[PDB]
Design a protein around this ligand. Structure first.
Ligand SMILES: */C=C/C1=C(C)C(=O)N/C1=C\C1=NC(=C\c2[nH]c(/C=C3\NC(=O)C(C=C)=C3C)c(C)c2CCC(=O)O)/C(CCC(=O)O)=C1C
Ligand SMILES: */C=C/C1=C(C)C(=O)N/C1=C\C1=NC(=C\c2[nH]c(/C=C3\NC(=O)C(C=C)=C3C)c(C)c2CCC(=O)O)/C(CCC(=O)O)=C1C
Lengths: 597, 600
């Protein structure tokens, strides 16, 4: 229910500033934060329904009507012409112009050489190499710039769990560096707002919130979507957490990489600390700059991997097409490259009953148990739902029966997906145990935990997975070469027979019934050799109409027939025609087996 | 010789400022620009070998010893304590701290609300869709931020040639937007310096340069590698070019994307214009924000293309495996997706003599001429040197004989690479004529019209092509599979009793590979319960030693034998048939299989 909270419509503001909701039609204040009455000259009752022009004057930029796409005006100087000296501090206002509403949020300008001072840090990360190095540079650098008691770089993992990869802190305190946080700690709804809004600040934990006096819009009958307002009141859940933790102030800048939330810059202050718009802007700069390189390094990295994976993939491809017989020594030369292409610990090549195991892989029968378990009609749902290749990260989770084997086949890639059998490929990564230094929750009591996760292999790279799909052509290549080898066998075997054999291709009624294959035993009985006989119609008068009719009836209706008939010599030669229909998937007779001794 | 100039060690400075080389060992000035003597107070002779501290009055930040990685201090306030009112304008100094040397460059503070003023422009590009929109936004925006007469975004192509993709200029002066420049215009070493040093400016073209008085280091014996120093003197080659062009001032910010020089922000002023420390810093900001967004959009874009090409690729894959017969109507449903996966204008599927041409492709016999031309032993070098698939951008260049056809097959992707025949795939792009609006070396532009070339084959489209090689082997497998199941059914339905014997080795036995029902019945036990059985099992344990020896000798030496022997009977009926074992030919000549015919 907590992971289902609205958070964007609390109907409350952070007291450090004022919020006003203005009807763009008449330019009158429809809703207002309780803090508005004090900053602005006039108390609540009269301030409500009053035009914005009457109570606040701003010289830099003014609001305006928006058509569809909402527009946002940055923080600019705002004055309060309705009171006998109301500036205990300088004030700055930002706008959120919507087609139905205007949202103005104001806060103290504050002050105190910043953007120029940040420049050498930005330049140093941009030229820096490696998420690690940059993350730690940003951590230390931002700790010097904005001055927080804690600056940590929180990286989101694949399942949206966090990890503190970098940290800069006061000499004192206990380092949270290396700590893992669940996905549940930062809900989807919250995460979305960090993308939409780049920098957010909790100025003082346990603030007395300022409610938006007319809770719902007086004419629209809806609450105020504070999704873009920085003054948006935080979840009490999270506030209690921070309070229990001893942290009183918070600055969180979003590390958005390729328009996706890669991670966060988390800043904690164990005393209260409002970070002014100008400073917020600098942290946003460093966040974007950090966000920039990581993506840069991510791009370069990927690029290099693609190239080498391709080189190896193409060798495997050419080497496989080049050899005409799948020898044990061929596969033993193949295996290293075939494991490398998918960065597997071991690979097992299946070819109908036979298994050619290589690298760090389970026993021949254990492998067979895995293939057998996959090929099953119970796990038929998995194979279809699988992209080009079936792959597991923790064998125990998807194949519960197979829960063991995990020390050597913790993860695997299986190709082909079809229960196609005969040829297959099983890539495997052995179990690699993860030591995950978690973090606690319920002010000076703390005991760390350390989950040791067995059964899981190193996660399958999406790039390694496409490298696997890219090698499907070795399976069809194996299969083609196999049938080609088996065919040339039976073709030689039938040609060396004594009992005169020919395969008759059923003409599609239009075309005649013709000779597909004919042996050296059979052609000889006719005289004319095999080459000249392939393609001639079965109709090769003298022959009795009664006998021909029986044979023709079989050809007509796709049935069998045993009939003695004369032939064409180079004695007239009378052999017994044993025409038999060869089975078809359609059930429609497509070919016939003709033999005669 | 020009494309191999040093440029990093000219031994000269831009007169607008002063450069000093300091020995970090005892803080003395070892080398100095001729301009140093005028602003520092003390003339050259005495200024040389003197400690920097005597002429130091820098309060903001000071130099320091470094270990390995050089460090750079930003432009900060510096004063000359040897002269009574030394300047007319404030002076600012930057440091380049190396483990062997310290490089201090100073220049007028100038000034003339800048970094906050730039923030909405950075904001505007960070949100922009597509490179084209961001490039033009940066161009216009930087032209407003600094009053340059010209601001152009120069994009490097695959061959390191440039293209002005964006431009913001004065109402007057002819637009260079759309102009193409050769790779020769910006040499490799020049390009390298734009990567190492992101921002570069020329204050006034045809400046009287300030030489570094002690040309080489007095103790190390090497010249001064400016490389990071903005005051560095640019090539006279390039200066003459700018002068001929009428431009007097420069400002070039590097668009480095994924650690590679993607392009440049070129700024021209037709009058002299020094851009201050605060100034350069803002352009640096916009350059990387622009570089940032370009790479971001590049990433996102690629990501989305990969996903849809995969979906389509997987449909082709499953749809091809699903059908058991390659009908004309199947291929006609396949063709659209099969062309789409590689963004081809037309595709032609070959299957032994037959051709199923689709989309905008040449005539059936013209296609055949292309395949024939590729499959040739003369172009055998091309095929091996290719990656997974053979591909051309301009058919006329690689296959000169095929120079025509270019209107419909200007470019193509051929697969399989092997002269494997029987099954193939020919993707084709028709000729798309390029109008390249070149630039004229010293007002006069040209317009190359390049015919014979198709749109360049995307590396992403090429890997999408390689990814579909499995359709060729799938076609072929299904074909041999069909031909095999034919002969396998034909032999199984025979009367004379036949079995195929697979020869073994030292540890391996001679086993039955294939056995028909006629053969199985004579033994009693069915076909399933016979495949893989050892040949020895079939004859009785009673069998005469004389007869078995003959058969074994054939198996031993891969020869033939015709011997009557009893059969292993479960019941007890003495079944004696003639074993007609014959060796089936092998390419090696070494008997690999035998044909076992059983007739009385
Ligand atoms: C209902 C689920 C939640 C549990 C359990 C919990 O502890 N918090 C829950 C909800 C929310 N968390 C929100 C923000 C948030 N959480 C973290 C977590 C950490 N920050 C750290 O620095 C560390 C450890 C060092 C942890 C584990 C962060 C960083 C943030 C962002 C703000 C901040 O702390 O800097 C959140 C959004 C609040 C809001 O704006 O309404 C919710 C709902
Ligand atoms: C030696 C061969 C060269 C020929 C021919 C030529 O035209 N230039 C040659 C050499 C160098 N060019 C260098 C720098 C440089 N080149 C450009 C290119 C252009 N600028 C433009 O505005 C346009 C078109 C509108 C083009 C094609 C620029 C911009 C620059 C940097 C200076 C500037 O901002 O104008 C160069 C390096 C010189 C240096 O810095 O030492 C060399 C050797």
């Amino acid at each position: 229910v907590c992971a289902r909270e609205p958070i964007h419509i609390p109907g409350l503001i952070q007291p450090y500033g004022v919020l006003l909701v203005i009807d763009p039609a008449d330019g009158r204040i429809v809703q207002a934060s309780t803090t508005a009455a004090d900053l602005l000259g006039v108390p609540m009752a009269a301030l409500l329904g009053m035009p914005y022009t009457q109570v606040l004057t701003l010289p830099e930029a003014q609001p305006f009507a928006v058509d569809d796409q909402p527009q946002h005006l940055m923080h600019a100087e705002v004055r309060f012409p309705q009171r006998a000296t109301p500036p205990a501090s300088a004030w700055v206002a930002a706008w959120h112009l919507y087609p139905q509403q205007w949202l103005v949020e104001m806060e103290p300008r504050d002050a105190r050489v910043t953007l120029r001072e940040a420049m050498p840090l930005l330049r140093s990360v941009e030229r820096d190499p490696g998420i690690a190095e940059a993350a730690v540079r940003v951590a230390k650098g931002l700790r010097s710039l904005i001055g927080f008691d804690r600056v940590m770089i929180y990286r989101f993992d694949e399942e949206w769990n966090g990890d503190i990869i970098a940290e800069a802190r006061k000499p004192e305190l206990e380092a949270y560096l290396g700590l893992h946080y669940p996905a549940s700690a930062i809900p989807a709804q919250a995460r979305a707002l960090y993308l939409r809004n780049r920098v957010r600040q909790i100025a003082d934990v346990g603030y007395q919130p300022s409610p938006i006096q007319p809770t719902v819009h007086p004419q629209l009958g809806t609450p105020v979507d504070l999704s873009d307002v920085s003054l948006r009141s935080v979840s009490p859940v999270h506030l209690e957490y921070l309070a229990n933790m001893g942290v009183t102030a918070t600055l969180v800048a979003s590390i958005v990489v390729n328009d996706a939330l890669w991670g966060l810059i988390s800043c904690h202050h164990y005393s209260p600390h409002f970070t002014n718009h100008a400073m917020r802007d600098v942290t946003d700069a460093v966040a974007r700059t950090l966000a920039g390189r990581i993506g840069a390094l991510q791009a370069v990295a990927r690029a290099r991997l693609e190239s080498v994976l391709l080189t190896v993939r193409e060798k495997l491809i050419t080497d496989f097409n080049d050899a005409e017989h799948m020898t044990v020594e061929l596969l033993d030369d193949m295996a290293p490259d075939l494991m490398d292409v998918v960065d597997a610990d071991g690979v097992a090549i299946f070819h109908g009953n036979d298994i050619s195991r290589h690298g760090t892989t389970p026993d021949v029968a254990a492998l067979r148990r895995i293939r057998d378990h996959i090929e099953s009609e119970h796990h038929e749902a998995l194979r279809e739902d699988a992209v080009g290749a079936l792959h597991v990260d923790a064998i125990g989770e998807v194949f519960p029966e197979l829960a063991d084997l995990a020390p050597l086949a913790a993860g695997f890639i299986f190709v082909p997906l079809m229960p196609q059998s005969r040829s297959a490929l099983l890539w495997t990564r052995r179990e690699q145990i993860q030591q995950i230094k978690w973090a606690g929750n319920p002010r000076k009591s703390f005991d760390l935990w350390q989950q040791t996760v067995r059964g899981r292999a190193r996660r399958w790279s999406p790039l390694h997975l496409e490298s696997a799909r890219s090698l499907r052509v070795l399976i069809e290549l194996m299969e083609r070469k196999r049938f080609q080898q088996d065919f040339t066998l039976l073709e030689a075997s039938l040609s060396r027979l004594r009992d005169g054999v020919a395969i008759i291709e059923r003409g599609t009624a239009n075309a005649a019934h013709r000779l597909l294959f004919v042996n050296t035993a059979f052609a000889d009985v006719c005289g004319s050799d095999v080459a000249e006989l392939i393609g001639r119609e079965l109709q090769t008068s003298d022959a009795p109409r009664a006998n021909v009719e029986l044979l023709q009836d079989a050809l007509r209706n796709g049935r069998a027939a045993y009939v003695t008939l004369p032939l064409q010599v180079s004695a007239p030669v009378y052999r017994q025609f044993h025409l038999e229909p060869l089975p078809s998937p359609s059930g429609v007779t497509a070919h016939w087996l003709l033999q005669l001794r």
